[PDB]
Design a protein around this ligand. Structure first.
Ligand SMILES: [Ca+2]
Length: 299
């Protein structure tokens, strides 16, 4: 297998879904660097896929916020869900609302059907929030058929979770607050063997951001911190760290990003990331073993 897996264009903040025997990864498309750039330039979402964890097919950019929504300008940090035989791609409009785009195909075109954000600063239960980043959705569908969107940023108590309707393009009720030590961004939920795993990127307060996690018997309460899933990957310049956890063909993987492509090309790595993948394992007690980044391809 190759490392890096995909270098055609820069990619970050992956999310993944399995459909018809393939693993699809959706990423923030980090636009090629421009002179004067001093923040993100993520206008669209890239999708790649595989059926063998060796050959990755480039599906291009499958969602563009300006082209494919009526209200959004950017599309940061996608979350993908397959439900109702449709694909729901949630995205952050740069902190200015969270959207949802829909397609009958994993590879789009995705289109946001709504006149405005799915979740906004005015959504009940979001505020009060001081210094929150209203972004970085992580959507999950529980065994009982209830979907949840986790989101937020920039503080221990700046996580929110809200129910989504079964149509996946509406909210139900109010958002509620969660807390996780040193929470910074990248909220993510998955369930395994009766446990809920809230994973996230930590802040820069005791070193560089790590992917850390909590476990609970419940989806929105009852969490306890359990440790680190992913340290800083190699070739990451002590910068941001963003992941997804996914099961594919009976094994588990963490998809994430680093800056190895930019490093090899001598390019500015801050906003020129590339997707990565590594295997993840569970301990017998259900905790997650810390992932070991690899640089010579999946084994
Ligand atoms: Ca995410």
């Amino acid at each position: 297998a190759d490392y890096p897996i995909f270098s055609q264009r820069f990619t970050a903040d992956p999310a993944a879904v399995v459909y018809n025997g393939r693993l699809y990864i959706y990423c923030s498309h980090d636009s090629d660097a421009t002179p004067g750039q001093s923040t993100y330039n993520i206008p669209d979402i890239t999708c790649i896929s595989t059926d063998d964890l060796k050959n990755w097919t480039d599906h291009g950019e499958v969602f563009n916020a300006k082209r494919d929504s009526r209200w959004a300008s950017v599309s940061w940090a996608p979350s993908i869900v397959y439900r109702n035989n449709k694909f729901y791609l949630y995205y952050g409009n740069g902190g200015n609302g969270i959207g949802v785009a829909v397609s009958d195909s994993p590879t789009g075109p995705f289109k946001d059907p709504l006149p405005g954000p799915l979740v906004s600063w005015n959504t009940p239960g979001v505020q009060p929030a001081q210094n929150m980043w209203l972004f970085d959705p992580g959507v999950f569908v529980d065994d009982d058929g209830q979907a949840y969107m986790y989101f937020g940023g920039n503080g221990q108590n700046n996580i929110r979770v809200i129910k989504l309707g079964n149509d996946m393009i509406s909210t139900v009720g109010s958002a509620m607050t969660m807390s996780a030590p040193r929470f910074f961004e990248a909220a993510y939920m998955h369930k395994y063997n009766g446990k809920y795993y809230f994973s996230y990127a930590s802040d820069f307060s005791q070193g560089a951001s790590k992917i850390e996690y909590m476990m609970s018997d419940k989806p929105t309460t009852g969490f306890q911190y359990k440790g680190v899933i992913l340290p800083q990957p190699p070739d990451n310049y002590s910068n941001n760290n963003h992941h997804a956890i996914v099961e594919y063909k009976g094994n588990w993987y963490v998809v994430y990003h680093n800056r190895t492509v930019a490093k090899q090309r001598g390019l500015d790595p801050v906003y020129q990331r590339n997707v990565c993948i590594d295997q993840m394992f569970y301990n017998a007690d259900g905790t997650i073993k810390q992932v070991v980044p690899t640089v010579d391809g999946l084994k």
